[PDB]
Design an enzyme around this catalytic site. Structure first.
Site, PDB file in Angstrom:
ATOM      1  N   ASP A  34      18.986 -31.663 -13.468  1.00  0.00           N
ATOM      2  CA  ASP A  34      19.644 -31.004 -14.598  1.00  0.00           C
ATOM      3  C   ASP A  34      20.819 -30.130 -14.150  1.00  0.00           C
ATOM      4  O   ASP A  34      20.624 -28.999 -13.702  1.00  0.00           O
ATOM      5  CB  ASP A  34      18.612 -30.155 -15.346  1.00  0.00           C
ATOM      6  CG  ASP A  34      19.170 -29.506 -16.609  1.00  0.00           C
ATOM      7  OD1 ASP A  34      20.309 -29.820 -17.019  1.00  0.00           O
ATOM      8  OD2 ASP A  34      18.447 -28.670 -17.193  1.00  0.00           O
ATOM      9  N   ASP A 219      26.783 -32.191 -17.914  1.00  0.00           N
ATOM     10  CA  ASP A 219      25.363 -31.839 -18.019  1.00  0.00           C
ATOM     11  C   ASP A 219      24.446 -33.064 -17.980  1.00  0.00           C
ATOM     12  O   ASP A 219      24.284 -33.765 -18.984  1.00  0.00           O
ATOM     13  CB  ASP A 219      25.124 -31.065 -19.321  1.00  0.00           C
ATOM     14  CG  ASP A 219      23.704 -30.538 -19.444  1.00  0.00           C
ATOM     15  OD1 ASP A 219      22.898 -30.731 -18.504  1.00  0.00           O
ATOM     16  OD2 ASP A 219      23.396 -29.924 -20.491  1.00  0.00           O
TER      17      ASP A 219
HETATM   18  C1  LIG Z   1      16.853 -26.815 -19.363  1.00  0.00           C
HETATM   19  C2  LIG Z   1      17.431 -27.776 -20.451  1.00  0.00           C
HETATM   20  C3  LIG Z   1      16.406 -28.882 -20.859  1.00  0.00           C
HETATM   21  C4  LIG Z   1      15.090 -28.581 -21.326  1.00  0.00           C
HETATM   22  C5  LIG Z   1      14.191 -29.612 -21.693  1.00  0.00           C
HETATM   23  C6  LIG Z   1      14.590 -30.964 -21.601  1.00  0.00           C
HETATM   24  C7  LIG Z   1      15.894 -31.292 -21.140  1.00  0.00           C
HETATM   25  N1  LIG Z   1      16.421 -32.612 -21.012  1.00  0.00           N
HETATM   26  C8  LIG Z   1      15.867 -33.797 -21.379  1.00  0.00           C
HETATM   27  O1  LIG Z   1      14.756 -33.944 -21.872  1.00  0.00           O
HETATM   28  C9  LIG Z   1      16.710 -35.026 -21.152  1.00  0.00           C
HETATM   29  C10 LIG Z   1      16.464 -36.243 -21.833  1.00  0.00           C
HETATM   30  C11 LIG Z   1      17.298 -37.343 -21.552  1.00  0.00           C
HETATM   31  C12 LIG Z   1      18.348 -37.229 -20.616  1.00  0.00           C
HETATM   32 BR1  LIG Z   1      19.419 -38.684 -20.245  1.00  0.00          BR
HETATM   33  C13 LIG Z   1      18.561 -35.994 -19.968  1.00  0.00           C
HETATM   34  N2  LIG Z   1      17.741 -34.945 -20.255  1.00  0.00           N
HETATM   35  C14 LIG Z   1      16.771 -30.251 -20.778  1.00  0.00           C
HETATM   36  C15 LIG Z   1      17.765 -26.965 -21.742  1.00  0.00           C
HETATM   37  O2  LIG Z   1      18.583 -27.827 -22.555  1.00  0.00           O
HETATM   38  C16 LIG Z   1      19.841 -28.304 -21.992  1.00  0.00           C
HETATM   39  C17 LIG Z   1      20.155 -29.627 -22.762  1.00  0.00           C
HETATM   40  C18 LIG Z   1      20.942 -27.236 -22.294  1.00  0.00           C
HETATM   41  F1  LIG Z   1      22.185 -27.752 -22.088  1.00  0.00           F
HETATM   42  F2  LIG Z   1      20.847 -26.816 -23.588  1.00  0.00           F
HETATM   43  F3  LIG Z   1      20.832 -26.150 -21.480  1.00  0.00           F
HETATM   44  C19 LIG Z   1      19.710 -28.589 -20.480  1.00  0.00           C
HETATM   45  N3  LIG Z   1      20.762 -29.090 -19.880  1.00  0.00           N
HETATM   46  N4  LIG Z   1      18.623 -28.358 -19.799  1.00  0.00           N
END
Ligand SMILES: C[C@@]1(c2cccc(NC(=O)c3ccc(Br)cn3)c2)CO[C@@](C)(C(F)(F)F)C(N)=N1
EC number: 3.4.23.46
Length: 377
Positions: A34, A219
């Site tokens: 991430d 991201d």
């Molecule tokens: C920490 C956080 C987060 C939290 C929970 C799940 C996810 N990611 C997914 O489940 C996922 C699914 C499919 C694909 Br391809 C990529 N990722 C991301 C917070 O949320 C954002 C999205 C942000 F930008 F708001 F901070 C981020 N990057 N990391």
């Protein structure tokens, strides 16, 4: 780097994860990669959607930092405890380091049923870490404690999915053509600047600050290309105009609804290519990355619908700026050159293409208008 190739897995639209170990003896976990966050956080208590979790009582190298942490998202949230322990990446660099770990003990709508990951590896900078910027992120600890160069690269591949995270260098086997760099504008998110946007060759013709209101970021932890309202509406207008021989319900353009075609008959050609021009390292020079519909129409795998190919529209509206998410990164080799404060893009070995069109990275392009496209300072 050959040992690190193909060290990423994923299910389409569920996220790309890498195997890691925590503790001594090592406990193996799958961890979401991430670039949009800065905490290393792992499930540390039983959960119905967790197949395994970090058991601190079984690690004699764990140290309790005696500080809790609460992390709310737009959707979902979790609470945990901070500590440090030994961490390694079995198919990454041949090193083990001590790193901060947020042990997730309680959560709500966070762990996704069937995602196969049990934690998140936040690869962005300390400035957006929780609870605050004094909590050193994993990659910072990795660089400080080892001889590994301060950069990593991500090759995310579409389809079950896979890819590579290369730590410490650039693997030339993973791309062709030139590698083009855009400056990291500020070290918190990986913030960059978009200077121009075209859809099927046609300039959207907005003041370029609009593209970066109020920031633009890269991201891997976001699926979609997310755009500010003004840019989003203009993009939907252009994409609708190009694909007007077929009309879809409003819900499709909002991402609330699938569109399906009999397997193998997706009319790729009625959907336009999207070009994002990123600020170059030289004044008023830019380069573009070009996005095919094979990227921004995200397939939704479902055995029940499998007589068809069905897709979600993976472009959506943001109120917190532009996000170049996985659908943008997929097919490109993306270099996060922290040491030189820049991000590089090149065409990946697994880039998308059909008989008529291909994803591309092209430059340089020169622009007379000398406006600074950054929204803030
Ligand atoms: C920490 C956080 C987060 C939290 C929970 C799940 C996810 N990611 C997914 O489940 C996922 C699914 C499919 C694909 Br391809 C990529 N990722 C991301 C917070 O949320 C954002 C999205 C942000 F930008 F708001 F901070 C981020 N990057 N990391």
């Amino acid at each position: 780097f050959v040992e690190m190739v193909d060290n990423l897995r994923g299910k389409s639209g569920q996220g790309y994860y890498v195997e890691m170990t925590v503790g001594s003896p090592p406990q193996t976990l799958n961890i979401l990669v991430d670039t949009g966050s800065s905490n290393f956080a792992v499930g540390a208590a039983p959960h119905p959607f967790l197949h395994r979790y970090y058991q601190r009582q079984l690690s004699s190298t764990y140290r309790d930092l005696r500080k809790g942490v609460y992390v709310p998202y737009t959707q979902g949230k979790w609470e945990g405890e901070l500590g440090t322990d030994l961490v390694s990446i079995p198919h990454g660099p041949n090193v083990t380091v001590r790193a901060n770990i947020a042990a997730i003990t309680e959560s709500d709508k966070f762990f996704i049923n069937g995602s196969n990951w049990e934690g998140i590896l936040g690869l962005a900078y300390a400035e957006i870490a929780r609870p605050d910027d004094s909590l050193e992120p994993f990659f910072d600890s990795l660089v400080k404690q080892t001889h590994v160069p301060n950069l990593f690269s991500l090759q995310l591949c579409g389809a079950s999915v896979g890819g590579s995270m290369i730590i410490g260098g650039i693997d030339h086997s993973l791309y062709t053509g030139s590698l083009w760099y855009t400056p990291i504008r500020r070290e918190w998110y990986y913030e960059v600047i978009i200077v121009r946007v075209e859809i099927n060759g046609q300039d959207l013709k907005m003041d370029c600050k609009e593209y970066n209101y109020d920031k633009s970021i890269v991201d891997s932890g976001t699926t979609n290309l997310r755009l500010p309202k003004k840019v989003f509406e203009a993009a939907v207008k252009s994409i609708k105009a190009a694909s007007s021989t077929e009309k879809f319900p409003d819900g499709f353009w909002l991402g609330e609804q699938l569109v399906c075609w009999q397997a193998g008959t997706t009319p790729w050609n009625i959907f336009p290519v999207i070009s994002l021009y990123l600020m170059g390292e030289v004044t008023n020079q830019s380069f573009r990355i070009t996005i095919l519909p094979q990227q921004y129409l995200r397939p939704v795998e479902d055995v029940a619908t499998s007589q068809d190919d069905c897709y979600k529209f993976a472009i959506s509206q943001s109120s917190t700026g532009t996000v170049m998410g996985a659908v943008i990164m997929e097919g490109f080799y993306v270099v996060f050159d922290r040491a030189r404060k820049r991000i590089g893009f090149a065409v990946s070995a697994c880039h998308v293409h059909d008989e008529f069109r291909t994803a591309a990275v092209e430059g340089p392009f020169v622009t007379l208008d000398m406006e600074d496209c950054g929204y803030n300072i």
